Every structure is written in C-alpha cells, then in structure tokens.
Paper text:
A map of the binary complex was obtained at 4.4 Å resolution based on Fourier shell correlation. This map provides an envelope that accommodates well a crystal structure of the RapZ tetramer and confirms the distinctive quaternary structure observed earlier (Gonzalez et al, 2017). Several basic residues (K170, R184, K194, R196, R211, R238, K251) form patterns of positive charges on the CTD surface providing a favourable electrostatic match to the path of the sRNA. The RNase E cleavage site in GlmZ, which resides within the single‐stranded region located between SLII and SLIII, is not resolved in our cryoEM maps and is likely disordered. The binary complex is also likely to resemble the postcleavage product, where only the SLI and SLII are bound by RapZ.
GlmZ stimulates translation of the mRNA encoding GlcN6P synthtase in Escherichia coli, but when bound by RapZ protein, the sRNA becomes inactivated through cleavage by the endoribonuclease RNase E. Here, we report the cryoEM structure of the RapZ:GlmZ complex, revealing a complementary match of the RapZ tetrameric quaternary structure to structural repeats in the sRNA. RapZ then presents GlmZ to the endoribonuclease RNase E in a manner that directs cleavage within the base‐pairing site of the sRNA, thereby inactivating it and silencing synthesis of the synthase (Göpel et al, 2013; Gonzalez et al, 2017; Durica‐Mitic et al, 2020). The protomers have two domains of roughly equal size: the N‐terminal domain (NTD) bears Walker A and B motifs and resembles an adenylate kinase, while the C‐terminal domain (CTD) bears structural similarity with the sugar‐binding domain of phosphofructokinase. Here, we have elucidated the structures of both the binary complex of RapZ:GlmZ and the ternary complex of the RNase E catalytic domain (RNase E‐NTD), RapZ and GlmZ, using electron cryo microscopy (cryoEM).
Residue numbers in the entry:
A (entry chain B): 1 to 61, 63 to 282
B (entry chain A): 1 to 99, 112 to 282
C (entry chain C): 2 to 6, 13 to 84, 86 to 92, 124 to 145, 147 to 282
D (entry chain D): 1 to 282
The structure:
RNA sequence: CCAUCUCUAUGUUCGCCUUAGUGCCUCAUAAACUCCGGAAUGACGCAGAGCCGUUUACGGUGCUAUCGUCCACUGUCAUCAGACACCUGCACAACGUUGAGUG
C-alpha cells in the first residue's frame, strides 16, 4: 500500500505530525538510518499496516546515503514526501516553548545559527520534498486540525484546469470557482461587421491583440491567479474551474480565455478548456 | 502641468489631504518651506508627472514678499492651484487632543495672506474624507459627474450565489477561523474572530493583493455610466470566514473610494 | 551502558539526562540497531508496547540472547487503572505513576547509575538595581537589552507574575533566544557544581525596574529547572513586601 | 552642529520615527529628492537646527555613484549620521497592509511580496552606509512608538568601553557589574601549596591552567555566550560596560581568564580594560 | 476628568559574622551573613467638569464530490432536489435570549 515520510526544521511540529499519523493509523517510529529497516517494515506490509516515518537532525544521515536509502526501497509501500517549515523567528519560538533539548550542535553553535545550518542539511531532503506545508502561523491547536484534514484527504488526483466563457444573457455558470467580467473591454458587436464574426475568429483575434492594454489584464489576471494557484493545489478539488463573463460568445474573447488556458498550459497545467455557451444548449 | 499647494490651520489634517494627493497619484513631500521649490519644480518637470506639496507654519516664510517671488520663479511647466482649508474652530479645538486655539489663532493670522491668495477656503470639519476628497476630486481633478454606487457582499455557497453582481471570489484557500471550536459559533463580524484572521498573515496578503486587482480595472469600469457595481466573496460557511474579507475590502472603498456598501446577505436572514 | 523501556515522558527523561533513545523498535531490529548504536558508543533506551510487542516473546528472548553485550541491557516496567505479562515480569523494575508525577519521576535520578551522594539547591532570584543587587548570589545577568514592558503603560503597574504581563514578553523572540542560551550556560557547569559540597546554588536576575522585566525571566528559568526535577524555589527580593 | 537621516525597509513604519523626531523638535522633511538635499543643508545652516530627513524608497537614485556623490556634497556645520530600520518580510507585510494604501512602485511591475525583496538590494547601499541599524520586528503600533524613545547621545555610546575586573569572593563582589560569573568550577592548581604562592597574574602557572584545557574550553563557551547580546548592550550608551569575574582568593584564578578575554578583543577590536581590583594594596 | 503631593533613563558614594591549614608570640580554606542619597515619565492622588441606570444567568449542523438547467425576458431572491462528510479542556471572548439588578 503506502509509505509516508515527515521532515522540516523543529517547529515543523514533526512530533505533532506523528500524532496525526497514528490518528491516521499509519505505523509510527522516531529515528534511524533504517536503510534496510523498510524491508523489515515490509513485515508491516505483510500485516497490511500502511507506514509513516520522520527525519530530523537526530535522524540526519550524507545526502548520497539519504538517497541510497530512497534507492533501497521495497516499492510495496510507496514513500510520499511530506515536509513542513516556517520563518526562523517562529520556529525558534516554538522550539523554545518546548524544553526539547537542542539541534544537538556539539559545535556549541547558537540556536539561530543552528536554524540556518539546519536548512542546508535539510536542503537535500527538502528539494526531494513533494508536499511542503508551512506551519508558520498555526498554534498547537491550529496545526493539528489543518493537518488532520489535509493529511486525511490524501487525494492522488491532480487539478484539471478549467477555463470557460459565457453570456450573462443565459447567465453565469453554477460550477465555476471565480467569476470575471470584461464588458468594459472592446466590443465585437462594436464594428457590427465583426459582430457575427465570433470572438474566436482569427481576424477578430487580430483585433483582440490590438488592445495589448487588454493583454495587460490578460497578463495581470494570468498572474493574479498564479498567486493563489500553488495555494490551491493542496486541497482535494479534483479540478479547478474558472468562469469568464461576457454578454455573448462573440465578446467571450475565449481567445484570451484560451490564451490563459494556453499560458497556464505553457506553464504545464491540465487545461480542459470549455466554451459551453458557444456549444448548442 | 497641474501643481497643487496645501495650507490651513494646525490640526486641519492637511496631511490627510497630502495622503489624498497620492490617492490621485500625486507625488508629494513633507514640510518644504524652500523657495527652491521651483528648483524642485524642475526636477518634477524632468519627471513631468503632476504632484503636490503643502505648507507648514515652518513653511510660512516670514516674508510673503518672498512667497510671490517663488510663484514668479515657478514655470509654465506647472500651474499653481491654491488650496486653503480651515475647519470649524471648535472642530480645530477638538481635533488636536489624541495620543489654546489662540496661540494657534496667531498662526492662522500668519496664513491669512496666502489664504487671500487661495483659490478657495473650505471647512473640512463636516466634509467626510472621501466626500471632501471627491469634492476636491470634482474641483481640481474634474472627477467625472457620474454616480457608480459600489456594493460588497459576503455569502455562502450552499445558500447559492447572489446573481446581482459582476464579481465573486472564493476564499476557501484562506485559513478558516472554524478550526477553533470556541469561535465556531462566533460570527464573522465578531472581533475575536477578526483576530484569528488578522493574525493569519497570508489573509492580509489576499486582502490588498486582491484589492489591487479591483483597482486595476476600476477606472475602466467607471465609464459606461455603470448605475451600480457589486462584488461578492463566498465561504463554504459564508457566516464567518468570508465576512471579514468582504468587510476588509469594503473599508478601503469607504475611504479611498466612495458609495461602497456592506451586505452579509448570508446572515441577513431574519 | 544500555536500557530497555506516561512512558513517553519517561522516554523524554532518558535523553534529557543524555541517552540517545528511540521509540517503537521491532524486536529483530534491536541487535541490528545495537550495531548502529555501537557506532555511537552512547547509552541508549527504547520504549516498546503491545502493538510493537510480538505474539511470541521467544523473539524478544532470542534478541536479548543476540543483543550486543558491548551495551549492558537494563530492564524497566504502570499506574492505577483509573489513572491509566511475559516480559513485564522480565522487567527488573516496576514503577507506579498513579499519583507520582514529573518531578517525582525526575526517581530516575536514583534509578539512573547516579545516586544521591549530596544535596544541591536551586534558588532563583529576581531583583532591581534601584534598591541594590542581591545581598549574596552565585551568577548575575543584566537583562536590560531585552524588550521592556515599561514601553506599554497598560502593564506598567502589573508585575511580571501577572499573566497579562507575561504575554507582552512571550511574543518577543529574542527573549526566547536569550532564555534558551542562558539555560544552557548553567547546564554546562551544573554537573561540576553538582560534584561539590556546595550546599545551595543561587542564580539571580536583574532588571533595573526590578519586577516586571526580570521575574518572568527567572519564572521561565524556574519552570525549566522544575521540569528537569532539581529542587527550585524563587524569591522576588523587590516583592518580599517588607 | 548635528545632522540626522532615517531610512529602512518599507514597512519599517519609519513614519512614526518622523513624529519621534518632531517630538524632539528636529526639522522633518519627507520624500525630498536627493539632488535637493545638499542645498537643503545650506538653507538649514542658518536655520540653526539639528538637521533631520527621511529617505523614501521612492527616492531611489538609479545612480549609486551619483547617490554617493550627493551624500558627499554634504556641506559643513552639519554632522551626518545614518539610521536604518528593518524587520521580517512577514512582519513588514502585515504592517504594509496596515498602510491603508501604498504602491511600492510594482505598478504593472510586481506584487507586494517581492517589492521589499528588491528593496533589499535598493537599500543594500543604504544599509552599508547605515550607522544605527534598528528593527521593529515585534513592537506593536502602540509599543513601537515608545521604543522610538530609545534615541540617545551617539557621543556617550561613542565610548565602546567594556571592562574585565577581577575581584575576591572572600572580600565580596563589586558594586559595579552587569555580568558576574562565579567560575570556581575549574580546578585550583592553587590547591597545590607549591603552586599556591604562584602570582595572581603568574605567567608560569599558565601551563597548569593550560593543563586544565577543560578550563580553557570553558573560556570558549564563555566568549560564545558573551558575544550573543554584545550588539544589544551597544544600544545602552552606558558610557562603559562592566563585567566582573571573582574567586575567593581572586587573581590567582580569575586574572588568567580575563586576560584571554581582553586579548580576544585586542584582536576583534573592542575597547576592553582590565583592572584587577583584588590586586589592589591599601 | 485633578494643579499640587507621593510612589514610576544614566551616574556618584557605605565592613565583618570566632566555620579549615601554611606566622609569630594570632592570618590562610568552606559555610553562615544586610543599609541610601542627586536631573524621566506613568500610576494614583482632590481644581473644574462630566453621569450611560449598574448589568453578567443560558441558546445556535455550520465541518466539506453533480447540481438545482423558465426566471421567465424579450430595453431573477429558485436556499427548497441532495453525494453526504463527520462533530485538546492564555489566541480563547461574541451576537441573540435570560437571570439578577433603577434612571
């Protein structure tokens, strides 16, 4: 079935996280090179007990050895990279509140410096990290609840990006996530010679390019979304949906919509574009 | 170009009008008593971007004969609009007290020669900052004479989405105050509630980042005599999370903007 | 040296002394983790429960037979069921936490190879330079550089012990960084001091105000020493109210 | 006369500092072009005021040699000093947000997130030039105002004096000290009666002292500790600072450690003084 | 909402306790040992003034994959049809109701 791994600089609540995983029901352990230990945790796999592990300065290995252990993987349990982290100031505060002894800086380093040295040694495993959830602002009560759910959803499904334009005359869809209007932008019914020519039309699309100013918004919007996009990825939405609102498909400038479905698609997104209003009712 | 000046009695919030300058995009500088302000006007002429400036009593130059020398030094590249504003004296008497009106009254006399040179004199005690500003917008910036009422709504998805609007924004990604069982019944309008949210840094990040966007298309939206405009925000439970966000966006417009409303339709029920 | 193990707190306690430790080690993994441990050459302990325990303790007996003696095993084992066989019988020790608690546990000092050969006292002290420094002490520490509540008059009246006051302090990280390093300093020489006939040992902390800005510091220092287990009582010299 | 300049990370809330200067009485000008600054100093010369100004991030030179060339244009009779003020990105944003409105440039150029990040570069020249770097990372809007009162004579703090003063537990402890550490943990080679009459500053004993490398390791961690908040102590302007190490006999033990410490600052470059009072004769 | 007292950054001075060890016919290791004055402000305090009636018993699922496809028109309040998902005792103290209690 599955292998889970935890990581992050203290304050990550990697121990608060380990609580959540037995609550999850995965197997629970503290610290070891355990390079050949997952073969014997394969005994855990014989018992059908999905697994969970944590890594820290205490469980620190050689990056070569960290990935040598990734190499020594019984595939039956598939490790799922989960790391957490936050700004030095807070992590420090949190560790401090704990009487947890230390980052074990035998070098007699200070703690703030220790926080810095730590990110370096946690850098090889934090670059291999796959799910990264910051803990910077959550008190012990707030960390656990968010964690319960995020961990709980555990959805493999990625996000099918959906772009859509419509006509308010019929109205605004019911299934989108974000609702934008651009009636203010140039009109296709304007130059009614082009009014029949849909917005998708290439020469009409040449008239769309004219307004690089509109293209400002294209970029602006493009970015606006980008900002929350990473944020969005963690949740179990199977698909992200967005609605663009015009009076008709002509003004839809689904070109733009498709240039944003193509711009996000250039970024590498799963655009599953739709122009439902264009299609027959 | 357009050149502003600001003057008035101490405690009249000339600074508020200097802050109002930047809302209209104007560069400004604090406490410039120099008559090389014209030299400053060259630097601003090289920029060629309209700006503004004010006059403290420190700026009061003992010789207003020197004040007209400066305006003579001031070039064609800019045009001086004399703004003078003394609030109800009681308001002025009331205003100074925070974290008499006679020692101050002396300096009003000192400002009396330039207020005679003032294009206008305006009591700001009653005019709301946004309203007086719009007045200052319609007086100097010729703010268009149309009335685009602004509306802000907070709702929940399960109850649907109010049709009467141009904009909607989910916030489910923003951190939820419901994690706390004590504040789960606590409504969004509640101040303890405000706290969980305010503490969440990112929240504040969506607040103005988001506000930014609205502004980006706001001048483009003003035209077309939009009789009205509405924007809404939604939460899985519109009762708590979305309220502070829509309310936070609403205060920006109350101030920077004008004709904004607050509509928690989700809880408007009974 | 090696050991075999509110059992979690106890585990916390073993590494607080200095024991590298680990939780939930399957039995066959112990002789193998005693090879890794041999790399460490440091005293060790591990906590094992029923979920980890095998249906047959023959695996445990075989592991104890295969256990590297280079590391000397030690065994330990409850509470009243209101407050809550084959190898708990093998446990040389059996201890009850039904009413026994953290300082009482800090038992482990006598249970540890260490034993009470002498008594040592931790008496933590707060004072202001305005009346004068302590009549006598061992260590002294200005704390003025730390953020000061005097800034906010809201708390100006309230002393440090006051929780509202504690709060102003808590947000300030430097405090935590200052409180953390300091603890350590004392940790470093505490053993040598411990290895002495010194009857008592009194640190003292000074903020000019002499109340709000320092007592808390020493109260946080007093609660860390109490968690460690060392006898700890404090005297606000300014607040004796004489 | 005196001259002052303030700047820092946008969100430093440097604005309150203006009010702080205005409460002191300094003539406060804001967002002034750098080109106009030197003339400003000249007109201020007969103004007879300790000059004060704030450097807007908006006042970004786009010419670092020219920016250095205006700071150099500075005329006489006015004494410059640079104030910096920064804090955490996270802390700043909330504060920035508190700015009801602001445009850190980033107009069709960036989102707030990295305006401060590029600012770091824009301010790097300023931060280099900085003379009194400060942070408001935690001061709340109400508690920061009171922090501003910290301003005090650069002349008094101008003294970096710090002292290492031996004393004798037998006789007592000094009335003057901020850090006092008993340190009677390290061995007493003085217990050896042959070594007992070795001097308070005996040079031969240093081998016995070296023999207790664990006593010399002590020093390492001791330093390590001391330096942690030494910059924080710099703020006080306590014209001098005081650190005392005592021993019942006194110098036969303490005089050696301090010596090393003083040296440790005869290399770092700190004004250290070593007066062994225990080594005092009626 | 109190003049006007009193308490709330920096720098100046203040001696002895027979316990352990290097005399000399009386000066040495560990334990026991406590006091003020000179230049910021806040807190109170008795110079105005001001007076909300004071209040303090108990009630709310709000936790999250399709979809409600006329809003009808011709210049909309459809939540309401649900898949149903289940529910750590200072941040940490609401908004309704209610004790209790004068303006």
């Amino acid at each position: 079935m599955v292998l889970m791994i935890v990581s992050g600089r203290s304050g990550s609540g990697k121990s608060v996280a380990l609580r959540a995983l037995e609550d999850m029901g995965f197997y629970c352990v503290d610290n070891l090179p355990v390079v050949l230990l997952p073969d014997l945790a394969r005994t855990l796999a014989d018992r059908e007990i999905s697994a969970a592990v944590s890594i820290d300065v205490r469980n620190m290995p050689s990056p070569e050895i960290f990935e040598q252990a990734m190499s020594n993987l019984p595939d039956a349990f598939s490790p799922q990279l989960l790391f957490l982290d936050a700004d030095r100031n807070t992590l420090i505060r949190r560790y401090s509140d704990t009487r947890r002894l230390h980052p074990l800086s035998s070098k007699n380093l200070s703690l703030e410096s220790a926080i810095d040295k730590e990110s370096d040694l946690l850098e090889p495993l934090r670059s291999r990290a796959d799910l990264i959830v910051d803990t910077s602002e959550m008190s012990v009560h707030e960390l656990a609840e968010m964690l319960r759910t995020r961990l709980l959803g555990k959805r493999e499904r990625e996000l099918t990006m959906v772009f859509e334009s419509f006509g308010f005359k019929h109205g605004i869809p019911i299934d989108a996530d974000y609702v934008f209007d651009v009636r203010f932008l140039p009109n296709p019914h304007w130059d009614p010679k082009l009014r029949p020519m849909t917005g998708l039309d290439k020469p009409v699309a040449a008239f769309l390019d004219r307004h690089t100013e509109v293209h400002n918004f294209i970029y602006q919007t493009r970015s606006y979304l980008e900002l929350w996009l990473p944020m969005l990825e963690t949740n179990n939405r199977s698909y992200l949906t967005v609605a663009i609102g015009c009076t008709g498909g002509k003004h839809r400038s689904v070109y733009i919509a498709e240039q944003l479905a193509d711009y996000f698609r250039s970024r590498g997104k799963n655009v599953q574009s739709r122009h439902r209003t264009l299609e027959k009712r």
